[PDB]
């Protein structure tokens with residue numbers, strides 16, 4: 001885990017030029033930069049150290065990512081705490097978030113096979129979190145803005161500030177958590193099921209202007225599948241492009257992920273295999 005001086009961060013970002021801002025978020029601004037004499041492109045997060053939440057998320061991200069390595073996780077290159085600052089340095093993901101290629105965007109729509117491969121890549125990253133670290137890691141903030149795409153469209157899970165480990169956003173929250181008050185990796189499975197319906201339906205997980213039954217995609221899409229009308233809320237670009245057996249396998253997998261009770265949901269390894277099976281059924 002590399003430690004950067006603050007002058008390196010300032011140089012990498014061209015003195016935090018607004019030219020290089022990729023976005024703003026609760027933690028702070030995210031900048032595009034380059035390091036190593038310009039051979040490595042980076043995403044640089046500048047937080048606010050006066051904030052308890054920011055400080056807690058900063059330390060959580062470092063303690064988590066400093067020990068993980070996986071093709072489908074964004075890599076932490078380093079950090080800077082110099083001058084009591086909170087800066088995180090990541091691999092740059094040139095194609096942004098999964099969400100920016102699904103809706104409310106002028107990016108072209110993604111072909112179905114590409115969407116399925118993005119979901120498989122994200123599932124492999126989550127499966128690694130649940131089974132490949134020293135203890136189970138619960139991400140706790142799985143959503144389409146926290147799946148990033150690199151220049152070859154490889155999907156990477158990002159944003160670990162809320163994750164939790166060790167043997168103890170609105171439309172993505174596991175409702176069973178508000179009832180059983182327990183932490184389980186099945187809460188990531190739930191969130192990921194919502195991401196799968198987003199890839200298929202190309203609309204927000206939560207749209208608060210709709211009819212009550214439609215507001216939450218986690219409830220609406222299973223309901224439409226049972227009434228034989230899921231095909232009617234599928235992304236218009238996808239209509240006629242999914243084979244019947246792929247569609248059924250994909251939809252049944254997503255429905256199982258958003259069951260009310262976590263004990264009935266599949267593991268991420270089971271989700272991952274069913275998606276790869278769905279991809280074979282598409283061919």
Ligand SMILES: Nc1ncnc2c1ncn2[C@@H]1O[C@H](COP(=O)(O)OP(=O)(O)OP(=O)(O)O)[C@@H](O)[C@H]1O
Pocket residue numbers: 022023024025026027028030042043074090091092093094096097145146148158159
């Ligand atoms: N490694 C990266 N490479 C390229 N772009 C990134 C990278 N990490 C973040 N970004 C971009 O930075 C922007 C801000 O991301 P941020 O983490 O603030 O999301 P947020 O939705 O504001 O916060 P949260 O989702 O955790 O509430 C997003 O547009 C995202 O595309």
Ligand SMILES: [Mg+2]
Pocket residue numbers: 025145146159
């Ligand atoms: Mg995010």
